Amino acid sequence: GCKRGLAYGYHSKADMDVLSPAVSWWYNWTHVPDEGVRPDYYRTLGVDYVPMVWGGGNLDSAAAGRIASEIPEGARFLLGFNEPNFGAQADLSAAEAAALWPHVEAVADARGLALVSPAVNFCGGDCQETDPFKYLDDFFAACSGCRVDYIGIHIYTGCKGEGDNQAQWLINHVETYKSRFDKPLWLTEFACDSAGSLAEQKEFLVDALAYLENEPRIAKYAWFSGRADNVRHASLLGDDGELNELGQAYVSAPQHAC
């Protein structure tokens, strides 16, 4: 249904009150929703929680059972491993990710969840695989019998883009995924990474959402993040329950069919 989500794990009730007019889903890199809004408040607001299996550690049938019984009632999706191609994140070869996928698929089969691939991006340092398109080709080869409904991607570019479209470098990467793969896409983290001022991140966000809302191959997208320390000007929230100017732009931006 509605595409606009958030990648954040520390929502308060008041935070979700001000986001929920347009932010219809979120995830938090684990499989149980943020303590501040659980077990009922997010459900009463009608915001969807999407669980994740972040990585490959401590994973077997017993763990799959536990995760399936801990994910809340109402789940419909399950995200696969986070940035496995990065040594500093889930740190799995495409072959290892494919070999452990049965545990992820066992959770989704038990609970009736649609599956998002492990989420990839370009890696430049400490990389199992630098090239995200290659990683995914290799994963699908190694996971030939596996259920994967959607492809997970992360994009972080500079803020200036091309001509009047400050999001052109992000658009160009989505167009590469669209040519390299046929499955629908979830853009589970994005922001620009060079913002010299708030105005630079705001113009990038506005042009990015106009593209993502109107691109049918993007099923869902999630801004990084509610409160971020290390991506300059990327936070949406200030004080408890207060959107900042960037949050207001994210909530107010036009939506496709929704």
Does the annotation list 166 as a binding residue? yes
What is the C-alpha separation between 175 and 26, in angstroms, rounded? Answer: 24
**C-alpha atoms less than 13 angstroms from C-alpha of 63 in its C-beta half-sphere:** 15
- Nearer to Cl ion by C-beta: 12 or 248? 12
Contacts of 174 (CB under 8 A, 6+ apart): 153, 155, 185, 187, 211, 212, 215, 217, 218
CB of 44 to Ca ion, least distance (A): 37
Q: Which does 57 bind (CB under 5 to 8 A by kind): Ca ion, Cl ion, none?
A: Ca ion
Angle between helices 198-214 and 168-180 (to 10 degrees): 30
CB of 26 to Cl ion, least distance (A): 15
Q: Among Cl ion, Ca ion, none, what binds residue 41 when CB lies within 5 to 8 Å by partner kind?
A: Cl ion
Nearest to 198 by CA among 236, 151, 242, 255: 236
Q: Determine whether the annotation assigns residue 207 to a binding site.
A: yes
* Residue 39 contacts Ca ion per CB under 5 A: no
Stretch in the footprint of Cl ion (CB under 5 A) among 36-44, 85-93, 151-159, 220-228: 36-44
Quick one: CA dihedral 100, 219, 89, 171, positive or negative? positive
Q: Does 41 bind Cl ion (CB under 5 A)?
A: yes
Min CB(85)–Ca ion separation in Å:
19
Query: 34 vs 138, which CB is nearer to Cl ion?
Result: 34
**Residue closest to Ca ion when measured from CB atoms:** 57
Q: Which of 40, 73, 164, 239 binds Ca ion (CB under 5 A)?
A: 164
If binding means CB under 5 A, how many residues of this protein chain bind Cl ion?
2
| Residue among 56 and 152 whose Cβ is closer to Ca ion | 56
Strand pairing category for 114-116 and 151-157: unpaired
Stretch touching Cl ion by CB under 5 A, among 4-12, 38-46, 173-181, 240-248: 38-46
Q: What six digits make up the tokens of 151?
A: 């492809």
- The CA distance from 96 to 90, in Å, is 11
Q: Name the minimum Å distance from CB 18 to Cl ion.
A: 17
Q: Is 149 annotated for ligand binding? A: no
In eight-state DSSP terms, residue 162 is B
What is the smallest separation between the CB atom of 57 and Ca ion, expressed in angstroms? 4
Tell whether residue 57 is a contact of Ca ion (CB under 5 A).
yes
The dihedral sign for the CA sequence 239, 249, 49, 9: negative
Q: Cα separation of 193 and 31, whole Å?
A: 27
Known binding residues are 164, 166, 207
Known binding residues for Ca(2+) are 164, 166, 207
Q: Which residues bind Ca ion (CB under 5 A)?
A: 57, 164, 166, 207
